[PDB]
Every structure is written in structure tokens, then in C-alpha cells.
């Protein structure tokens with residue numbers, strides 16, 4: 046099957062890229078190794094930057110996001126037993142913190158793609174990349190895991206297949222440089238059936254560790270506890286999880302944490318990762334296939350959306366005028382934004398998490414930063430602007 | 436000899452405290468173990484916070500600071516071969532980065548104190564503190580090192596005697612908690628007979644290490660190079676110093692580093708240190724006797740001035756109304772400001788210095804932070820407000 050751009054992965058990066066290309070008359074074929082049900086059924090976060098909201102609306106796929114999304118005026122930084130509100134709406138001159146679950150974004154983009162004649166193969170298996178260093182790259186795969194071996198002949202391959210996809214290894218080790226940080230802690234995330242304890246997100250730093258109170262709906266809440274990076278979910282009974290959440294979220298004015306059944310519990314590791322370059326011949330990486338951020342800053346899906354806007358612009362210049370300049374500089378342009386988001390995500394992570402390797406001096410300056418950011422208008426404005434994207 | 440407040444040390448802390456107390460009719464006696472010539476020859480601080488400039492003017496001792504000090508509208512962060520201006524004057528609503536050397540501040544305060552009947556003993560020896568946990572603390576010392584043993588009977592002792600003075604050990608180890616950070620680098624500081632290369636301070640991050648271009652006068656410049664903490668001045672010839680300064684300060688638009696005789700060179704170590712509490716009975720610490728910051732943020736002299744403003748207010752409430760509240764909370768009030776300045780000094784230090792222990796990712800985030808603080812109005816404003824001093828309590 047011949048196309049212009051072969052896309053590996055139907056996450057936010059692959060789906061947004063395929064639709065941006067469609068809006069400019071450029072054809073694509075997406076392959077996805079999981080089922081449509083699986084990709085549409087995640088409990089992944091939905092904190093969207095203003096740029097991602099603008100992009101969804103610009104693309105004509107933002108109607109359900111605007112109708113069903115939750116628009117908050119701010120969020121809270123809790124530390125030393127006190128909550129401190131960051132009024133994003135006041136500090137940014139009218140913007141909101143937007144939440145619209147990643148699975149909802151995926152559902153909207155899959156539906157828009159299928160409705161506009163888009164080609165998406167779900168449940169593919171045995172995926173491989175070939176001749177990426179030529180003008181005729183190829184993608185090979187088997188439909189429905191064990192179908193006959195099929196080939197996509199294309200001009201470009203977009204590697205939108207996440208951290209463990211096959212596209213990043215297709216950039217030879219001798220050409221790439223990787224940057225990484227392993228945080229000395231992980232998150233224990235829980236999906237709970239209970240009303241929300243507060244109207245806005247709560248990012249809490251406590252002597253015992255970090256806690257994050259988020260939401261999905263009026264009935265379903267999403268909460269996280271910082272845990273030691275080696276910890277297993279079998280070390281954390283429901284009783285221990287709720288006791289630790291109550292301890293870390295405690296306030297002098299008496300906060301009431303609403304508890305319920307934990308439908309899901311799991312440990313997720315926290316990492317920073319940057320691959321440079323994000324291209325090799327006709328292969329171009331975007332999103333988690335090229336870089337990872339710790340989720341404290343909620344930048345991952347937003348960076349995937351920024352990467353594909355640059356890639357689509359380069360592809361458009363190639364098909365319209367035969368120009369290669371923007372494609373040649375795709376890595377250069379994307380990395381400028383990536384490094385700033387990596388810095389912010391690292392800043393939020395280190396400011397809010399307990400580090401047991403920290404000296405008492407380091408813990409003192411961590412608490413001093415928390416005091417400063419919540420008592421300075423410029424520091425709070427900078428946090429607000431970084432949080433909703435810039 | 437009886438007095439109200441016995442002060443150990445004639446640095447910025449002790450001198451500012453003695454004069455603030457004089458302005459409120461409170462007597463003091465200062466003892467200083469170095470000569471007046473030695474303390475007036477001090478080479479270190481150059482930059483004053485806006486609050487310290489306001490304090491010197493408020494106290495009636497700011498005339499020479501205004502006439503001879505240098506008032507800059509901003510400073511530069513140089514990285515990736517390009518200079519980025521932080522317009523402090525614009526971002527702070529009218530404040531300046533003030534360059535007026537620590538030794539000039541000391542000269543002005545010693546003169547003002549002596550002119551107003553102040554008692555200062557220079558070149559003292561054999562100094563000791565006694566009965567600090569009583570209502571009658573005492574300071575013992577020998578004038579001119581070989582004098583007869585003298586005693587100062589006072590109501591309070593102010594420990595303004597610097598990092599290695601005798602006052603901090605007088606707070607028992609069982610009552611205090613110390614916080615510290617060790618840095619792998621030091622500063623090689625030089626004094627050069629040359630004109631200024633630029634109108635404003637230059638803080639440069641380079642692959643080879645940090646460099647700072649500061650000034651003293653139109654004819655004397657003060658420059659610093661980051662060096663390994665175990666380096667000695669004999670490892671650094673004048674040729675090696677200039678070659679390293681030219682390399683680290685290089686810009687794509689071609690910066691001209693103005694050279695001349697390097698008449699002073701020395702290596703100075705750096706650290707972060709906080710002692711909590713800063714008081715024990717009638718003994719109260721202030722300045723470097725209580726806390727140290729690495730010099731990248733130009734906070735140390737400024738923090739000593741902030742500490743003594745709080746201490747003077749407490750002492751004033753005690754003598755005027757017999758109230759102990761402000762004195763009881765002196766450590767609490769001072770520490771809130773100290774911790775924020777400790778964070779900022781650590782932030783400036785770690786963003787600008789080369790650390791060979793950094794992973795490639797940590798080097799990337801360091802350069803991203805330099806890009807961020809120079810590309811956001813709110814981030815540059817936050818940087819500027821911290822640089823010229825956060826609001827006083």
C-alpha cells in the first residue's frame with residue numbers, strides 16, 4: 046500500500062500528525078499495535094496546555110473538548126500544612142487550567158480521522174522499519190497480529206510509537222546522543238470511586254513525601270503518592286495508601302480527604318529522557334518516542350502536539366514547494382521547546398518531591414523555594430505561565 | 436566598663452548595629468581583634484541591595500555611598516557566547532544594582548561611629564564570652580593584645596564576629612542545628628589596574644567554567660574565575676588568568692576584555708551555612724557569625740544588614756517598653772529572610788558554575804535555566820527582585 050507519510054502509533058502524536066496532514070491534502074496511513082478499545086480506554090491524565098487547546102480548535106476537532114472539558118481558575122501548592130492557591134486565571138489575564146482526559150482526546154481524533162477517510166490499522170503485529178536512509182522508506186507489519194505480511198511504501202516515516210516503540214532504535218546508536226535522569230522515587234497511582242475533596246488540583250509536598258490529588262469526573266478521582274523507586278504494589282495495602290494520603294495531605298485548618306474503593310493501583314517510574322537527533326534520513330520521531338518528562342509538570346502530550354506541528358510544517362513545505370529546510374531543522378526547532386519543558390518538569394519534580402538523599406540544607410532551600418513561589422507575584426506568574434504553556 | 440550592648444566585631448553587622456542603636460539612644464561598646472587599617476583594607480563585597488542603600492541613607496551615613504558608589508540599571512547573564520541584559524531598574528520599578536565596596540562601607544561607618552562618641556577598641560586580644568545565659572553577660576578582652584584584662588558588663592552581647600569568631604561556639608552544640616553545603620569550586624579573584632570592559636556586571640557561564648566581571652572604580656576592576664577548590668594561586672600565572680578570562684568571556688559579537696597589571700590575586704573558598712538558632716540567652720548572632728552564602732548572589736553583607744535591623748528593633752522595644760517579644764522572635768524573623776537568600780545564592784551558584792559531576796542531562800537543564808530566566812518577563816522580574824533584595828519583613 047502506497048502513501049505519502051507512514052505513521053507508527055495512534056497516540057496523540059500520530060493522530061494529531063495524520064489530521065494536520067489531512068488538513069493540507071497530504072495522505073498518511075497509521076498502524077497501531079493495540080486495539081481501538083485499548084487506546085480509547087486509558088485512564089491517562091488530561092492536563093492540556095493552552096497551545097494544545099488552540100491546536101484542537103484550529104484543527105476543527107475541539108468541540109467535545111470545549112463542551113466536556115473542565116476549566117479551572119487555578120491549582121494549589123500545599124506545604125508546611127498549608128494550602129497556597131496559584132490563581133492562574135488572575136495571573137495570566139484570563140486563561141484557565143484545562144483538563145480533558147487523554148483517552149477522550151484519542152477518541153475524538155480517531156473519530157475525526159475515520160470520518161475524513163483516514164486509514165488506521167489497529168491490533169497490528171510484527172512491525173519493522175526498512176530503508177529509512179533512502180528516498181523510499183518502508184514499514185512492514187501483520188494486520189490483526191497474525192495476518193499476511195504487508196508493506197507500506199512511503200516518502201517519510203513518522204515514529205509516533207512511544208518510549209518503547211520500534212522507531213527510535215531505527216536511528217543508529219552511532220548517530221544519536223541520549224540524555225537521561227532517573228528520579229530516586231516513583232508514583233503509586235490510584236483510581237478511586239469517591240466525590241472530589243477539592244475543586245482544583247492539589248500538589249502537596251510533605252515531610253513524608255509528595256501527594257497529588259487530581260480528578261476524572263464528579264464520581265471518579267485520580268490520586269498519586271510518591272514512593273521509593275523499588276517499591277512494589279504488594280508493599281501497599283489499601284489501608285496503607287489511604288493512611289499515607291491522609292498524613293501527607295493534612296493541613297492545620299483540617300482538610301477532609303474523601304476516600305473510596307481503589308478500583309486500580311499501580312506504580313509508575315519517573316524519568317527524564319531526550320534523544321538528539323529526532324530524525325535520520327526519512328524517519329522523523331515525535332512525542333514519547335523522542336523524549337520523556339516526569340509527569341509532575343503534565344508536559345508529555347503537550348510536547349507531542351508541539352513536535353508534530355513542526356513536523357507537519359516541514360512535510361507541507363516539501364510537498365508544496367520541494368523545500369527541505371524545515372525538515373532538515375525539525376530536530377533543532379523541536380529541541381528548543383523540549384529542553385524548556387524538560388527544565389520545567391524537572392523544576393516541578395524537584396520542588397515538590399521528598400528526596401531522601403537530600404541534606405538538611407537542601408530540604409531547607411526546597412521549603413524556601415515553595416515559600417518564595419507562593420509569596421511573589423512574579424514567581425507565581427512565571428509558574429502559572431509555564432504550567433499552562435508558553 | 437559598663438554598657439547596654441557589647442558588640443564583638445567591627446564588620447558591617449557590628450558597625451551598622453552600633454550606629455542603629457546610637458540613633459535610638461542605646462549605648463554600645465565594640466571590640467575588634469584586627470586593626471582599623473586592616474578592616475578598612477578588606478577586599479571582598481562589591482554589591483549592595485536596594486534595602487542596604489536605603490538603610491545607609493536613612494541612618495545619615497550614605498553621603499559618600501551616593502557620591503562615589505556606582506548605580507547600574509542592570510546586569511548581564513552571558514552564556515552560549517551571547518550577552519543577555521537583566522534590566523533591574525525597569526523590572527523593579529526604579530531600583531539599581533549598587534556597587535560600593537565593603538571596605539568603603541566600613542570606612543564610612545567607623546568614621547560616623549567615632550564622630551558620634553562611639554566606643555571602638557581595635558587590635559584587641561584574648562577575647563572571651565561569659566554568663567551569656569544570665570541577665571548580666573560579660574565580654575573579656577585585652578586592649579592592643581598586651582593590655583590588662585578588661586571586662587565589658589552589658590545586658591546583651593551581639594556576636595557580629597564573622598564565621599570564625601568566638602560568639603557562635605558560645606551557643607551550646609546541644610541547642611543548635613547546623614545546615615551546610617560544600618562546593619567543588621572556589622573563586623580566583625583579581626584586582627586589575629584597567630578601565631571597565633563594560634558598563635554593567637557580567638556573570639558568564641562557559642563550557643570551561645564561570646567568570647564574573649565586576650568593578651571598583653574607573654581605574655580598578657574586580658574579576659573572578661571559577662577554579663577547582665584545591666587550586667592555589669601559584670598554579671595561576673597572569674598569562675593563564677587572562678587566557679582563561681578571554682576564553683570564558685568570549686562572545687560571537689567579539690567582546691573586548693580590557694587588560695592591565697593584575698596587582699592582587701587570591702583564591703577564596705565558598706560555602707552555604709545556616710545556624711539555628713541565632714540566639715542563646717542574652718547572646719544574639721548576626722551576619723557571617725550565623726550564616727554564610729556562596730558569593731554569586733552578593734547577599735552576605737546585605738543579610739548582615741538585614742539581621743541587625745531586626746536585632747536593633749528588638750533591643751529598642753526592650754529598652755523603651757520592657758518588651759521581649761521581638762527579641763524572642765529575632766531568630767525566627769531573621770531565618771525567613773536568610774533561607775530565601777540561601778536558596779537564591781545556591782540557585783545563582785548552581786546555574787552559573789561548571790560542575791564536572793553533572794550528567795549531560797544536568798548540563799542541558801543548566802543551559803535551559805539560563806535561557807528561561809532571560810526570555811520570560813516574569814522570570815527576569817523574579818531574578819531581578821531576588822538580586823536587589825526581597826522586601827523586608
Ligand SMILES: Cc1cc2nc3c(=O)[nH]c(=O)nc-3n(C[C@H](O)[C@H](O)[C@H](O)COP(=O)(O)OP(=O)(O)OC[C@H]3O[C@@H](n4cnc5c(N)ncnc54)[C@H](O)[C@@H]3O)c2cc1C
Nearest residue numbers: 054056057058077078090092206207332333343345346347
Ligand atoms: C502518570 C502520567 C500522567 C501524565 N499526565 C499528563 C498530563 O496531564 N498532560 C500531558 O501533557 N501529558 C501527560 N503525561 C504524558 C503523556 O501521556 C505522554 O507524553 C503521551 O501519551 C505521549 O504521546 P505519544 O503519542 O508520543 O505516545 P503514546 O501515547 O505512547 O502513543 C504511542 C502509540 O504507539 C503505539 N505503538 C507502540 N508500539 C507500536 C508498534 N510496534 N506498532 C504500532 N504502534 C505501536 C502504542 O500502542 C501507542 O498507542 C502523563 C504521563 C504519565 C505516565
Ligand SMILES: Cc1cc2nc3c(=O)[nH]c(=O)nc-3n(C[C@H](O)[C@H](O)[C@H](O)COP(=O)(O)OP(=O)(O)OC[C@H]3O[C@@H](n4cnc5c(N)ncnc54)[C@H](O)[C@@H]3O)c2cc1C
Nearest residue numbers: 444446447448468480481482596597722723734735736737
Ligand atoms: C569573594 C566574596 C565576595 C562577596 N561579595 C559580596 C557582595 O557583593 N555583596 C554582599 O552582600 N556580600 C558579599 N560577600 C559577603 C560579605 O563579605 C560578608 O557576608 C560580610 O563580610 C559579613 O559581614 P559581618 O559583619 O557579618 O562579618 P565580617 O565582615 O567577617 O566581620 C566580622 C568582624 O569580627 C572581627 N572579629 C573576629 N573575631 C574577633 C574577636 N575574637 N574579637 C573581636 N573581633 C573579632 C573580624 O576581624 C571582623 O572584622 C562576599 C564575600 C566573598 C568571600
